[PDB]
Amino acid sequence: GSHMGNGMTKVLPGLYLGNFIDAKDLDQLGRNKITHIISIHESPQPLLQDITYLRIPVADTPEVPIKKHFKECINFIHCCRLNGGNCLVHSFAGISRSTTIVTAYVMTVTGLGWRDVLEAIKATRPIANPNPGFRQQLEEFGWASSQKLRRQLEERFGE
């Protein structure tokens, strides 16, 4: 009965992962004081009041370059966290798309690789599994952009 899978999962203070159901769960949203949400869905959806949204129209296929949205998502999340908010990143199944964006974020703030990060995320959400293509994009991001972004965030929002 008690399995780590009852609503969005806390990934870090002020950061959560979820599916389309958690994204509409007012009880969950209130419980976790969610003030920001990143919706990674192919189509626009009615937005809940008192929440700041970031829409990322991307499908879950290994050919889709979600890496093109890493910078903006990480900046959105960071701003929200360092300013006392709570961000929920979600995708329909709560499996690969939202997971990819959050992994990229944690990689930049910790300086750790995507495998260790993904494995750490799985501990608190065993369904976590970005598609093969997103994992490669995570590979790139780790090598290239990760570190630069960390320094950038420090500049834009401070440490």
Ligand SMILES: CCCCCCCCO[C@@H]1O[C@H](CO)[C@@H](O)[C@H](O)[C@H]1O
């Ligand atoms: C996870 C449970 C899925 C139950 C059947 C869902 C059928 C709709 O399918 C869903 O369409 C969405 C776009 O509209 C896609 O983003 C999702 O990946 C896709 O599963």
